[PDB]
Amino acid sequence: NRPNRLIVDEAINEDNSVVSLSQPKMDELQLFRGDTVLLKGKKRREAVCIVLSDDTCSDEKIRMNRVVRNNLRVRLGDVISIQPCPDVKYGKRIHVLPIDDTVEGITGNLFEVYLKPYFLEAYRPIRKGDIFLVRGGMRAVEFKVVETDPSPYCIVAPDTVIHCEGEPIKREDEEESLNEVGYDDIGGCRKQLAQIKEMVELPLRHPALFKAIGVKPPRGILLYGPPGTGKTLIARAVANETGAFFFLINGPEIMSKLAGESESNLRKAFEEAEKNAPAIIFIDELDAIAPKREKTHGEVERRIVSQLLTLMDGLKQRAHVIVMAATNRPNSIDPALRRFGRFDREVDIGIPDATGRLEILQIHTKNMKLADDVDLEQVANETHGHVGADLAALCSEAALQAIRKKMDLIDLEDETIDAEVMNSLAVTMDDFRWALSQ
Amino acid sequence: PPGTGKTLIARAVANETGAFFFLINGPEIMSKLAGESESNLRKAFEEAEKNAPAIIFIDELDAIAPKREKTHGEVERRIVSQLLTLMDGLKQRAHVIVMAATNRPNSIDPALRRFGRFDREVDIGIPDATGRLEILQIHTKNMKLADDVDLEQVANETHGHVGADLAALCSEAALQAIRKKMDLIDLEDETIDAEVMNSLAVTMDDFRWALSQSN
Amino acid sequence: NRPNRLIVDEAINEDNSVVSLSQPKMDELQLFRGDTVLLKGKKRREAVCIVLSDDTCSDEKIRMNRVVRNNLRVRLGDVISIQPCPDVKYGKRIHVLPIDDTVEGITGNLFEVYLKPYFLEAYRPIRKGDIFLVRGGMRAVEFKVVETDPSPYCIVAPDTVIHCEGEPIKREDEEESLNEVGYDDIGGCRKQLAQIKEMVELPLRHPALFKAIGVKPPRGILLYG
Ligand SMILES: Nc1ncnc2c1ncn2[C@@H]1O[C@H](COP(=O)(O)OP(=O)(O)O)[C@@H](O)[C@H]1O
Ligand SMILES: Nc1ncnc2c1ncn2[C@@H]1O[C@H](COP(=O)(O)OP(=O)(O)O)[C@@H](O)[C@H]1O
């Protein structure tokens, strides 16, 4: 009895201007694959998009990517209205400008470098006030649409004139950076990723539920696993992606403080994260603060260990605050914390398998011109047992290996580099092959 | 073992025999400043004799009173004795009782079991199946369960779970129902009336799920 | 489309007054083995040198040693211009002086001890304002050229009078000590030495790159052993 409302869920097709429904739901709203749909959302906000069928997608849900949700002002698991839009006319004029903080650095002709291959032969449906993302020149450029000739909303057919005029613009207060971290930056471990959300879904997203029912959320979540395996990442993702307030407790950064002033921080950390709730408090490197008491030869070394557990209990359910933690192994840390009062919930962010490796390889190659011979599938399948820092630097150094060759050539020119010089810069399977020796 | 119902039983007994209850939460003391740690520990007793007959309950005793081999510390140990002073300063006739909870006998200082103070020691072990079932029942008591919900089965498969394990198992299996009906409610967009809640059923497939989650 | 510009790379012949190109690059600039070449570099700076063929050397690159690069004001991997110089006349007078901090200690006749066996039968191309290094007497002596009779630049043939006159001189602000440590002081481990440079090449040498690209350098390097 509310058909056109829908839930928001992950993109499987990560093109900017494509949303995906189930096959029934298209039959329900009398929509056709390829039709331009219009979606409305919070803060009076509209986006226009191309609809497609997804066999996997649940009837209730709609798959879309950050670019989209951003202009709608929603986060994952929110609700929006979708209605057809076969009244959209081809555009004559589009006045697009870049957001200054995605362009400080690269120089040259954005019109040519990013906009041209993006819009080319796509017939994209845009809208006055959209914010979109282009991937090249070893970075991402964010563009806002200031005016279109068929206002508000128009299609971009080959015919369309694209006004690149003048200034890079400043970022508005509530428009988040598509540069910022999110789930689409994560790879390999999908299972765990879910388990996290669903625990944290209700208390973060529907915080007023738990004052109204006697039931209790998680308070604490712990992250197992090898180092650099995406722990610090996932956490910052989840908060940014569920719009939660984020406060970081960087283990060593506390232990570096003066005695007692260590605790003084640890309080204010919580104290603030209850003021700005619903919140994640994230403890990176927990074994730096809370090791097994056998390891704690120290009065003040231990004073903190308890000081934590005090605040971890002083944490109300109804404060709707959650604490996530990251350590290197369970044995590292004090057992008391896994007392089913505080860090009851414990996730094994392990290693990637080949499919996961591949996924991650993809995630860092996303802003680079790869050559046709580049076979990431291969790269993954031989790199048994690599974490997503391993695989991420593997990219970085294989890119730097291409930059070195073209760099010799550039040095003869002696010129600093325009984006255009960057866009022409290819990365090869022999540039990868190399970074493998490391 | 931890979360086995120790902190529970204690607060039950006091509420159920109308005794005055004062809680000494181990870490909560050790989190204090040196000496102000002791200053509390006195007032704790001092008050519990004023409000007698009373149970003074020490949750997580191994936090305050570990084996002296573990107590590399002057003030870490100063407290350990400060307890034993008050445990003796406890009159019989004060009709006050102290209950304590630790994770294992080896955890704690042997002196306390000196037949002066903690002479009496109870083994709150794990549940058997019948006990599990009992506990499952105890947290399902405010929820509409579906006819297919067979707690008997749940208990019977869940070998070796403590009553925190089994209690959260419920909580998350309920949250798992709340999620589905929650999708549906989100379309309404309404916050929830009790009436909405009363209609909210919990299923064996809602339970089945919360089983994947491990402890 | 800029042929005469070249990259700077390690010396394989560590004689002071010899630079080495590839065999194609000599055919490209129409240079002959033994020809006196003139090289220009940053801060208005010139050096003059003898060119040779190196089979190993990459066409793009030029092999030279610290003595050289110093007077050019460049470090490894920089760019310079090389042009022939068959107009260099034999020298009559050369007014050379030592730099005080490479001579406090040793006493005696520098003219005889260091300059004489150095210049002997070499036909070295020097230049007014060059800084060169001599190896003997259990140390290294650094000499600056204050004036030459065919100014600015001249060859040193047996005929040449070498004026050793007077004072040791102080070091100028930007002229680094060739006494100072460098790669030519290193031995054995060649592989590692490369691996280091290349990591540290881009961020140290081209530091404004990494504000302009999302890619990241190394931050830390550790040394086992
Ligand atoms: N699965 C992954 N997907 C994408 N990036 C990853 C992944 N795993 C690791 N990374 C990269 O490596 C780094 C991971 O470090 P992090 O999770 O912060 O670990 P830790 O706290 O374990 O040191 C991140 O900066 C990220 O760019
Ligand atoms: N036998 C049981 N019957 C009912 N509930 C239990 C039982 N054992 C544990 N629980 C539940 O789990 C928690 C037990 O925690 P607690 O007794 O405080 O453990 P500890 O002091 O052992 O950490 C309680 O909050 C309670 O709801």
Author numbering:
A (entry chain B): 21 to 458
B (entry chain A): 246 to 460
C (entry chain C): 21 to 245
What does the paper say about this structure?
VCP/p97 is a homo-hexamer with each subunit consisting of one N-terminal domain (N-domain) and two tandem AAA+ ATPase domains (D1- and D2-domain)234. Connecting these domains are two linkers: the N-D1 linker between the N- and D1-domain, and the D1-D2 linker between the D1- and D2-domain.
Since all previous structures of ND1p97Lng proteins were solved using pathogenic p97 mutants, the solution of this wild-type ND1p97Lng structure has confirmed that the deviation from a perfect hexameric association of the ND1p97Lng is not a consequence of pathogenic mutations but is caused by the D1-D2 linker. By contrast, in all structures containing the D1-D2 linker, the electron densities for the side-chain of R359 is absent in all subunits in the asymmetric unit, indicating this residue becomes disordered in the presence of the D1-D2 linker. In this paper, we show that one such element might be the linker connecting the D1- and D2-domain.
